[PDB]
Amino acid sequence: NPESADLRALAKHLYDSYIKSFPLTKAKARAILTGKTTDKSPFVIYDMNSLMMGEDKISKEVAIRIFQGCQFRSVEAVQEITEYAKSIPGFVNLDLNDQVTLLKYGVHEIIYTMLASLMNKDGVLISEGQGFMTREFLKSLRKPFGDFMEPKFEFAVKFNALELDDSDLAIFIAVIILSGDRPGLLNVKPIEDIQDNLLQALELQLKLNHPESSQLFAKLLQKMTDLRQIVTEHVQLLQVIKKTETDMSLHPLLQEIYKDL
Numbered sequence: 001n002p003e004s005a006d007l008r009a010l011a012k013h014l015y016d017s018y019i020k021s022f023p024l025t026k027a028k029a030r031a032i033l034t035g036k037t038t039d040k041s042p043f044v045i046y047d048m049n050s051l052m053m054g055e056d057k058i059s060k061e062v063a064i065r066i067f068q069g070c071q072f073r074s075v076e077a078v079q080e081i082t083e084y085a086k087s088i089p090g091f092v093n094l095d096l097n098d099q100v101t102l103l104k105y106g107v108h109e110i111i112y113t114m115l116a117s118l119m120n121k122d123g124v125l126i127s128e129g130q131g132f133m134t135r136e137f138l139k140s141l142r143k144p145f146g147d148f149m150e151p152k153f154e155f156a157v158k159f160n161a162l163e164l165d166d167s168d169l170a171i172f173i174a175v176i177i178l179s180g181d182r183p184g185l186l187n188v189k190p191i192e193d194i195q196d197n198l199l200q201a202l203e204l205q206l207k208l209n210h211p212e213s214s215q216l217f218a219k220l221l222q223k224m225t226d227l228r229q230i231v232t233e234h235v236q237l238l239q240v241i242k243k244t245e246t247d248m249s250l251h252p253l254l255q256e257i258y259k260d261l
């Protein structure tokens with residue numbers, strides 16, 4: 001019926017621009033990870049030598065070198081997410097400062113939601129899925145660097161259990177961006193009206209897409225406490241790095257997001 005239709009229409013619209021804005025979807029990710037024939041097997045990096053062997057395609061010192069990598073990829077993700085946000089009906093019509101504020105707080109929560117897509121209990125796709133880097137290798141890195149990925153993996157395992165597909169996530173990450181309770185928002189109300197609409201998009205999306213799945217909407221919403229969790233941990237992890245590795249550069253775009261989080 002006409003309300004549903006309007007919401008389904010919204011669902012399709014977001015799935016479509018989500019596909020357009022993100023080169024490594026979950027569907028691709030799982031094909032690579034599970035061993036399907038639509039895609040290519042990843043090289044696997046499980047230790048120092050394979051790191052060195054993987055290098056050739058796919059300089060300070062390993063742990064820092066890997067870390068810098070995750071960060072540069074973060075910046076790209078920020079761009080990806082920024083382009084996607086623009087496609088969210090009403091988003092570019094907001095106060096410019098709120099648009100900025102929504103992204104400042106939004107992108108990390110979204111980065112880790114989608115990073116889940118690239119993860120299973122044993123490791124994570126890198127270099128656009130050409131690589132795979134195992135959780136143990138990471139966890140093995142010289143502290144404090146052995147610690148930046150574990151909390152991600154932890155969330156990812158819980159979260160991947162919900163069994164969401166890209167078309168569920170497209171709406172979910174829209175919901176995240178359009179969070180009216182962000183620090184310093186000028187006009188909360190129009191932000192809430194859009195989110196009210198996205199939420200309704202999601203509630204229907206989940207019920208149609210996952211009908212046997214009880215209270216998935218509620219369960220998916222509850223997952224945001226985990227996101228903020230790992231997001232704050234990360235910035236604590238960074239305050240420490242900055243403190244001990246004063247020769248390690250940090251990207252300005254990322255310095256902007258990190259400040260006063």
Ligand SMILES: CC(C)(c1cc(Br)c(O)c(Br)c1)c1cc(Br)c(O)c(Br)c1
Pocket residue numbers: 024069070071073074075077111115118124125126127128129148
């Ligand atoms: C390691 C990982 C998953 C990563 C990405 C982001 Br964004 C992060 O913020 C954090 Br922390 C880790 C990644 C994924 C892809 Br695909 C890559 O091409 C590369 Br190079 C690295």
